[PDB]
């Protein structure tokens, strides 16, 4: 973070995929170097698209998992259901990839057989092996990165089916025990969103979720099948 570009012109972490291309004039790439200069005046409109959890219908019955893959949009909303993580090629990734255990961890670039590689993802065969199963058995709940053209991509889970289907159904990818008493994070968490109003704080949150510069940072406590987790969440309360 000290000097994002080292003395030799290159990005300071060479295990980071750095294939960025700001061809749509969104200025997401300048925000990479000046992230506290983010212009927040569009946030009230972008965040108005997300509905609070109390707007959602009560769930019931036993909980199953999400294999539908419906045309969902807007990963910046907490209720976004993602698809399960797989391997993604470095050619489409711009910046560090963080996965959430719920605690944040970075997945450097590797070759297809998992050996580490160190060329900022310029090889067309470099990948980021993000395949996830939910811990304690697995590794992490979900991941979040930025693609070349500047869109927040995210994966993980799969999310949960809490009962009902249609207009106002909540496919829970976080702790939704408000709507289903078994919809805990460990059962249903699929990434950084710890509650409908908290996401995990990590060094690039403000770049991947810039309309959360707003949020207050709370020390929170997560229990994942025994192993106690003490991590920082950025929550929207006021």
């Amino acid at each position, epitope marked *: 973070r000290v000097q994002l*570009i080292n003395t030799n*012109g*290159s*990005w300071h972490i*060479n295990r980071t995929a*750095l*294939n*960025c*291309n*700001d*061809s749509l*004039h*969104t*200025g*997401f*790439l*300048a*925000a*990479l*170097f*000046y992230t506290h*200069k*983010f*212009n927040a005046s569009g946030c009230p409109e972008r965040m108005a698209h997300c509905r609070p959890i109390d707007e959602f219908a009560q769930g019931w019955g036993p909980i199953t998992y999400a294999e539908g893959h419906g045309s969902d949009q807007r990963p910046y909303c907490w209720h976004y259901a993602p698809r399960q993580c797989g391997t993604i090629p470095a050619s489409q990734v*711009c910046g560090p990839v963080y996965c959430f255990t719920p605690s944040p961890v970075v997945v450097g670039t590797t070759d297809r057989f998992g050996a580490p590689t160190y*060329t*900022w993802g*310029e090889n067309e065969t470099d990948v980021l092996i993000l395949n996830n199963t939910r811990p304690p058995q697995g590794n992490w709940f979900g991941c979040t990165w930025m693609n070349s053209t500047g869109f927040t991509k995210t994966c993980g889970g799969p999310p949960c089916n809490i009962g009902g289907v249609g207009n106002n159904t909540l496919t829970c990818p976080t702790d939704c025990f408000r709507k289903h008493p078994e919809a805990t994070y460990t059962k249903c968490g699929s990434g950084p969103w710890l509650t409908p109003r908290c996401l995990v704080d990590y060094p690039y949150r403000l770049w991947h979720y810039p309309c959360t510069v707003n949020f207050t940072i709370f020390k929170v406590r997560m229990y994942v099948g025994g192993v106690e987790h003490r991590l920082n969440a950025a929550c929207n309360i006021g």
Partner: antibody
Amino acid sequence: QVQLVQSGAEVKKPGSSVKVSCKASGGTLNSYEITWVRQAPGQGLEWMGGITPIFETTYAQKFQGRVTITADESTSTTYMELSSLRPEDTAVYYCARDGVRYCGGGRCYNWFDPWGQGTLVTVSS
Amino acid sequence: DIQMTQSPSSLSASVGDRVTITCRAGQNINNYLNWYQQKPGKAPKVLIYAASNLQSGVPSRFSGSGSGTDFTLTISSLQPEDFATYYCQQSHSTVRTFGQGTKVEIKR
């Protein structure tokens, strides 16, 4: 989607100074990588200086001490002030955005896009 | 500051011909080099960035190449609407420096 809009044209007597403004709007930063370049009639391009989003200024070799670049984030307006005007500084003064726009091979590159509409400054008696 | 030298200053070429514009940097700038096109009466627009990458919308006839100190711009088959002055500009130092420019004109 960002737009740079420079101030109108200026007529100045030799020896005085001029302050060209460049206001940025409609973008994702509150302050931009603002760079300045001029071009005399029929002449080539001459780079003068720039300012980072956190207001750090760089200047060219032949203009230092004569040019000052300032910012104001409330209006997102960048200012360029050149002093001791001479007849030879008759030029059209451009402001542009020199932000990062491509990273590859572990390196990132900047170039001028978009441009302001220009400001003509004539220096005569 | 890094001195960029362009060659030649003026050039007249028939349509369909091939034109080679050289930019020579004072010191090694690797590939931190852009090419602007300037039609008279208008602001310049970039056409090639990072030595060799074609900006969006630019015809494949234009092409950049070179790394370090010697850079060229090549228009494979000149066209009537390619009349302009072309400038190279290094982006290796924070103090940006331009080339002297190459005005190209349609021979007939």
